[PDB]
Amino acid sequence: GEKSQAYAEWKKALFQPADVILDPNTANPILLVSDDQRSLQRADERQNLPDNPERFDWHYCVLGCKSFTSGRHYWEVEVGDRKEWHIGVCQENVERKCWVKMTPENGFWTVGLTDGSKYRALSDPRTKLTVANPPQRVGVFLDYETGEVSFYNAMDGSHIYTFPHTFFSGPLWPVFRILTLEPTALTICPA
Amino acid sequence: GEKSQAYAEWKKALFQPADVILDPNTANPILLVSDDQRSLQRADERQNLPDNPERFDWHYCVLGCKSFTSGRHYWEVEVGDRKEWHIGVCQENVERKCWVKMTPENGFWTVGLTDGSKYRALSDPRTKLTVANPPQRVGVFLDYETGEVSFYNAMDGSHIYTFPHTFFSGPLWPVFRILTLEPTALTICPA
C-alpha cells in the first residue's frame, strides 16, 4: 500500500529504530513483564516485589531498559484489541512512589485508550482524539531536540496525535501503562 | 510562554520560512487579492477576468507565487474569526478548470473550517477534527522529501492535523480557498 510504504520510508529517512525491552525492576508490582521482556500483563492483585527506588508503586507503569538524551527514535507497540492501554515517554525524574497526574507538566507524554473506544492524549486537560480506524499497532516517535512526541497507526501510516513541542529535562524513557486485567497483552515490536 | 517558545525553536530548527504572496493570476474570479498580495477576500460575484490557463475557474482557490520541489518549508496564515477557510498545498498539475474533489488523490492537501465550528482535513473520506482551541493563526508545514503536510495552532503550538506521509509528484504550491462572504480576510504572515 502506498501509505504503508511512505510510512516505512519516513521512519527510515528520519528516526532510529529503538529496540525496546521492558525493565521488570521499574514495573508496578501488579504488572507482569514476560521473560523475553517484550510483553506486559496485569495480575489480579499486587505481587510481592522489592520496592527499589525505580519501581512505580502507584501508577501501573513500567519503563524501557534504555533512555534517550538526544536524537530521533521510534518504536512500535502491538496494542491489538486491548480495551485499555497508554504508551509514550517520561522523564527520568518523574515521581515513582507518590501519586502525580500523568501529564506533560509532571514529565509524562502518553496517549491511549479507555473502555474499548475512548482514545485520549494525556495532556492537561486530556485531549479527546477521534480515530477513524482503531489501531492494532502504534508507532511512538521521539525527537529529543525539538521536544516532539507523536503517535501513528503503524499499519496504515495514519497520524494519531502530536503533543505541543516542549523542552525535555533529562533522559526520556519509553513508558507503558495498563490498568485492566484482560486477555490481550501489550507487546513491543522488536527493531 | 514555553509552548510558543518551543514552537518557534522547532520551526526555526527544521523548516525554511516561506515568504508567501498570493498570485492574483491564479485566483478564481470570485476572489479578491489585496494590493500587497498577503490578504484574500471573496467578492459578491465573479469579476470579469481572463480565463488564462493558470486561473482556477471552478474551485474558489488561489496559489502562492513560488512552489516547492524539495525541502521543508512553513508559513503562517491569520484566519482570525473567519467562519470558513481551507489552506494547504496542491500539485502544479491539479485540475484548475473542471470540477474535481479537493483530495490528496487529486493533488490537494488542505484542512480548514466550515460554518464557524466544523474543522476538517480534506482527506477522502473527510476527517472530522476535534479542536479544543479554535486557531486564529495556522502554521502550514511541508516536508517534500518525507511527503509530510502538517498544520499547527501558530499561537499556542498545539497540533491540528498531519496527513498520512505520501509521495509527492512535481512542485507543490501554497493554496487558499474561501467559499463565503464575510468580514474577516485571510492574511498571510510575512516570513
Author numbering:
A (entry chain A), B (entry chain B): 323 to 513
Sentences from the paper on this structure:
Vγ9Vδ2 T cells—a major subtype of human circulating γδ T cells—respond to multiple cancers and infectious diseases in an MHC-independent manner; they are specifically activated by small, non-peptidic diphosphate metabolites called pAgs. The sensing of pAgs in target cells requires a surface protein, BTN3A112–17, that has both intracellular and extracellular domains. Here we show how—in both humans and alpaca—multiple pAgs function as ‘molecular glues’ to promote heteromeric association between the intracellular domains of BTN3A1 and the structurally similar butyrophilin BTN2A1. The BTN3A1–pAg complex functions as a composite interface that directly binds to BTN2A1, bridged by the pAg molecule at the centre of the interface.
Alpacas possess three butyrophilin molecules: VpBTN3, VpBTN2 and VpBTN1. Among these, VpBTN3 accommodates pAgs and is required for γδ T cell activation.
